[PDB]
Amino acid sequence: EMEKEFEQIDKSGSWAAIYQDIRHEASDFPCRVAKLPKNKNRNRYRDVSPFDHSRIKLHQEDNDYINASLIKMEEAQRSYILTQGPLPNTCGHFWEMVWEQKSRGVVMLNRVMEKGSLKCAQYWPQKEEKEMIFEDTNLKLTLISEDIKTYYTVRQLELENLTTQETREILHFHYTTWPDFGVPESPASFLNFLFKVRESGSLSPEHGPVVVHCSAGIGRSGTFCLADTCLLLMDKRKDPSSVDIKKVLLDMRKFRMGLIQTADQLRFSYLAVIEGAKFIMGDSSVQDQWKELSHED
Numbered sequence: 553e554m555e556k557e558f559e560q561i562d563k564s565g566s567w568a569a570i571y572q573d574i575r576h577e578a579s580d581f582p583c584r585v586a587k588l589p590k591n592k593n594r595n596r597y598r599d600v601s602p603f604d605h606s607r608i609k610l611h612q613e614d615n616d617y618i619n620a621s622l623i624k625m626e627e628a629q630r631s632y633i634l635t636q637g638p639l640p641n642t643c644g645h646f647w648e649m650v651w652e653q654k655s656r657g658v659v660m661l662n663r664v665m666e667k668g669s670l671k672c673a674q675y676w677p678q679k680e681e682k683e684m685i686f687e688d689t690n691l692k693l694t695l696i697s698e699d700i701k702t703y704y705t706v707r708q709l710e711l712e713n714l715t716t717q718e719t720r721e722i723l724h725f726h727y728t729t730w731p732d733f734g735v736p737e738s739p740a741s742f743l744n745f746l747f748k749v750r751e752s753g754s755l756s757p758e759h760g761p762v763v764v765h766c767s768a769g770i771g772r773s774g775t776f777c778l779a780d781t782c783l784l785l786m787d788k789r790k791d792p793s794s795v796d797i798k799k800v801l802l803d804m805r806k807f808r809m810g811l812i813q814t815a816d817q818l819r820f821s822y823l824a825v826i827e828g829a830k831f832i833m834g835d836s837s838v839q840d841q842w843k844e845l846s847h848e849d
């Protein structure tokens with residue numbers, strides 16, 4: 553059981569060793585496209601790059617590079633795209649990828665400003681009447697509506713391909729109280745937000761992969777995706793003891809580096825999956841309890 557393991561870990565105080573053990577074993581694949589000179593201004597952090605094998609390519613002939621990867625979880629049957637916070641020159645490339653990849657949802661786990669720095673571009677419109685036009689990739693993006701809770705906001709955005717005039721509805725789920733290099737305030741408020749995303753349909757396999765990002769696309773995003781996948785794996789089998797969280801994380805780290813950036817975020821994932829297991833295993837009433845606990849209103 554993950555729960556007995558949690559207890560050993562905690563008792564022996566060795567979250568840091570455990571986490572280091574994962575970092576040591578994580579895969580190392582080339583990121584030669586990321587490191588081409590021409591892409592330097594497409595990467596927010598010099599030490600966070602997409603592997604070549606899993607990177608998302610833009611369907612453009614000029615330069616197909618974006619800092620983004622496809623995390624394809626075979627067994628679980630779920631994929632995600634993990635990407636950094638768009639830069640002021642790659643917001644057009646971001647929405648290009650959303651369009652071409654056919655995603656329905658975008659999960660934003662950071663604020664634009666954190667720890668006194670600009671962690672991400674303001675890449676979506678904040679009022680209905682001031683849409684965004686991304687001229688390099690020839691897309692218009694409009695705020696259609698927004699559901700502001702205390703700790704997250706859900707926006708419906710309309711993405712127009714200005715060439716064909718085709719239009720798509722994207723949902724944006726903005727978690728605003730999860731600190732960089734930090735954890736959510738409680739398992740309940742994170743699980744409540746995760747289940748908002750699920751219930752919206754955006755993780756349905758009839759859509760392209762959901763796009764998940766934080767500032768670097770690895771720490772907060774890794775934590776979110778690990779919890780989601782572990783819960784889905786246990787759902788498929790109705791067998792919580794078959795799920796091995798660290799092994800799930802190593803498999804995700806085959807497709808992007810650095811997933812989960814600190815030992816406490818690893819700790820947090822166990823908490824989130826252990827609590828989430830209650831819902832998976834047939835008490836849906838816990839979902840209402842999460843909602844109340846997270847004071848969403």
Ligand SMILES: O=C(O)C(=O)Nc1sc2c(c1C(=O)O)CCNC2
Nearest residue numbers: 597733766767768769770771772813
């Ligand atoms: O946004 C996150 O959750 C995350 O992984 N952020 C990261 S991972 C990372 C950095 C940051 C950052 O935001 O400064 C700075 C460069 N080193 C690795």
